[PDB]
């Protein structure tokens, strides 16, 4: 029950500044009149954010697919209740568990279920002449839903001469999906007003899935007919160190990104804001290794295994030959790669990781048996041959390598 809207017009993404907004309370602890250094995921100051606007040239209605990466800072400037909902998921299909956060009318429904999404999912509000409030009418986000878990319903994320700039931060740490937000009336028509504020923690849902790609649900005006307006900014969080000055009221009033520029790194080092005249020592300029070279001693005499596997004659099993091999480099790679051998059964250490394995002696025992007698190779194996003949000790066993030689 999904609709494919192939009419979307695709263009290279626009860009804008982020200034200094994007700071959120790192932990649910009250701090007062203190400078605190934290190391968490943040939006770097004065970074490039990808402003997505339902503009025009062919009305540019915009609802692209944006990778989730390692958390997302979203910010919408709205007046007409358009940008409503979000979708999170690594493949955005019915094969991988997915997240749907719908801020529908009178409610917010957060679901983690196996959804079969639309190729172009969204929601659709249709006006009714009877009711001034628009009726949430079209709900076309998944074609089917099954295996629902953690169906969470709470009070809806509150809706605030002013545009209600709403800022959200979405994080997913160790199976906890943290949602941060703050609403502020603003004047600036399209972008963040010069100023600073911090987002409250609200809720931290226990959602135990992986997210790498995501989508924005939007409202479309049907006068199919489409419209939108307003605008949604997206920025990508990175590991950073931030210095935050908690005031007397416990509200974060300012923060400093410790890697923005040398001045900010200085302030981050002195744990203060006003720096006196003069030189300071901040960090260490250490060049990085361009590459790594691993060198191993020149190939020397090999262990002569080409004279025992390809030997013309093989001794009788009652007088099995056991040759000592030592003082040579053991290149088992070629013999393991050769497919002429019937099997390759090494115990304890897998053949893929014996290259780094080093040994103090090896005894190569060579004989001929039957295929049904291979099952007689066991620690303290039972049977006439295994008892009155060559017996494998009950201790740990080495490796067995066999091939059929009927011809």
């Amino acid at each position: 029950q999904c609709v494919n809207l192939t009419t979307r017009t695709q263009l290279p993404p626009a860009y804008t500044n982020s200034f200094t907004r994007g700071v959120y309370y790192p932990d649910k602890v009250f701090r007062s009149s203190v400078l605190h250094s934290t190391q968490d995921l943040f939006l770097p100051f004065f970074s490039n954010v990808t402003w997505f606007h339902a503009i025009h040239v062919t009305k540019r209605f915009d609802n692209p697919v944006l990778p989730f990466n390692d958390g997302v800072y979203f910010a919408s400037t709205e007046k007409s209740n358009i940008i409503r909902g979000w979708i999170f998921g690594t493949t955005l299909d019915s094969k991988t568990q997915s997240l749907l956060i719908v801020n529908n009318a009178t409610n917010v429904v957060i679901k983690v279920c196996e959804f079969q999404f639309c190729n172009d999912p969204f929601l659709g509000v249709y006006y009714h002449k009877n009711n001034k409030s628009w009726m949430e009418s079209e709900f076309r986000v998944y074609s089917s839903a099954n295996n629902c878990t953690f169906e969470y319903v709470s009070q809806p994320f509150l809706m605030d001469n002013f545009k209600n700039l709403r800022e959200f931060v979405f994080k997913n740490i160790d199976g906890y999906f943290k949602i941060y937000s703050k609403h502020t009336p603003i004047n600036l028509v399209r972008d963040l007003p010069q100023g600073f504020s911090a987002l409250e923690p609200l809720v931290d849902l226990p959602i135990g899935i992986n997210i790498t790609r995501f989508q924005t649900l939007l409202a479309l005006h049907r006068s199919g007919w489409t419209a939108g307006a307003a605008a949604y900014y997206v920025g990508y969080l990175q590991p950073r160190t931030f210095l935050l000055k908690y005031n007397e009221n416990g509200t974060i009033t300012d923060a400093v990104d410790c890697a923005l520029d040398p001045l900010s790194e200085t302030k981050c080092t002195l744990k203060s804001f006003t720096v006196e005249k003069g030189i300071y020592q901040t960090s260490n300029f250490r060049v990085q290794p361009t590459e790594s070279i691993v060198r191993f001693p020149n190939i020397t005499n090999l262990c002569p295994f080409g004279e025992v596997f390809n030997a013309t004659r093989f001794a009788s099993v009652y007088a099995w030959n056991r040759k000592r091999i030592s003082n040579c480099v053991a290149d088992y790679s070629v013999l393991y790669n050769s497919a002429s051998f019937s099997t390759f059964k090494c115990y304890g250490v897998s053949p893929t990781k014996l290259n780094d394995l080093c040994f103090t002696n090896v005894y190569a025992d060579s004989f001929v048996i039957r295929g049904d007698e291979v099952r007689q190779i066991a620690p303290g194996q039972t049977g006439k041959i295994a008892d009155y003949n060559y017996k494998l000790p009950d201790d740990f066993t080495g490796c067995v390598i066999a091939w059929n030689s009927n011809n």
Partner: antibody
Framework: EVQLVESGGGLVQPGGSLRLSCAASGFTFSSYAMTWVRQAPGKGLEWVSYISGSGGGTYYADSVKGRFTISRDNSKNTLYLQMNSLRAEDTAVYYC??????????????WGQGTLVTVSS | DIQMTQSPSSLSASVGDRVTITCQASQDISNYLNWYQQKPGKAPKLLIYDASNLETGVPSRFSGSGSGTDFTFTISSLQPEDIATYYCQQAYAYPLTFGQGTKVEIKR
């Protein structure tokens, strides 16, 4: 040919109620917005209202709070403006404007011909 | 809101002369400003949006410049028919911000 002609402007007594009409053709009144502005004879411009695909997400000026109410229309797809509690100093020629995108500031387009309204006994 | 000090209120300059209409504001609007043309008894017309981009249907002889707190809006070669009322308008804290207007006339 883009055209936005205005009608309904004229004589209303103080406190009267009226629906001004701004009839639209040659485009899409939805994906494009509309905006009432007014020119007083001998005076400057002053904006009144927005509209954005619907008349619920709009705005009004500090000087116009409570008097005017914008509205649209389906099918024939025209614009309406409801007036109440007019005052004598508000006589002006009103204009129903437009835009083209809205997401990234709001730049007008059609700038229609304008219609005169005067309120007196 | 923001106050717009648009000057001069009136100006007379001969044919071909350059005309610059300075449109003032309050704080760092940068280039986000547009200019509109109003003929007497006629509906307003688009001239330039974002102070730098020329749209369709506008003669190339119309030019505009300035950013931040000052704006030029400079006319290259004055034609006898350019006489109209010009308004400078913007968008930032809602276009409540309008200008008192400038009346241009031509010496002949």
């Amino acid at each position: 040919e883009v055209q936005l002609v205005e009608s309904g402007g004229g004589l209303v007594q103080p406190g009267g109620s009226l629906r001004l009409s701004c009839a639209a053709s040659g485009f899409t009144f939805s994906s494009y917005a509309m905006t009432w502005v007014r020119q007083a004879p001998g005076k400057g411009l002053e904006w009144v209202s927005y509209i954005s695909g619907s008349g619920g997400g709009t705005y009004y000026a500090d000087s116009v709070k409570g008097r005017f109410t914008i509205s649209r229309d389906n099918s024939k797809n025209t614009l309406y403006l409801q007036m109440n509690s007019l005052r004598a100093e508000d006589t002006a020629v009103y204009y129903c404007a437009r835009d083209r995108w809205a997401s990234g500031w709001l730049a007008f387009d059609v700038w229609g011909q304008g219609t005169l309204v005067t309120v007196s006994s | 809101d923001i106050q717009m000090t648009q000057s001069p209120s009136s100006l007379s300059a001969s044919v071909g002369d350059r005309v610059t209409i300075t449109c003032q504001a309050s704080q760092d609007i940068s280039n986000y400003l547009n200019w509109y043309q109003q003929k007497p008894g006629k509906a307003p017309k688009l001239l330039i949006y974002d102070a730098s981009n020329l749209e369709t249907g506008v003669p190339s002889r119309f030019s505009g410049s300035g950013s931040g707190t000052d704006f030029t809006f400079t006319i290259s070669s004055l034609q006898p028919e350019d006489i109209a009322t010009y308004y400078c308008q913007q968008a930032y804290a809602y276009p409540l911000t309008f200008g008192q207007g400038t009346k241009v006339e031509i010496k002949r």
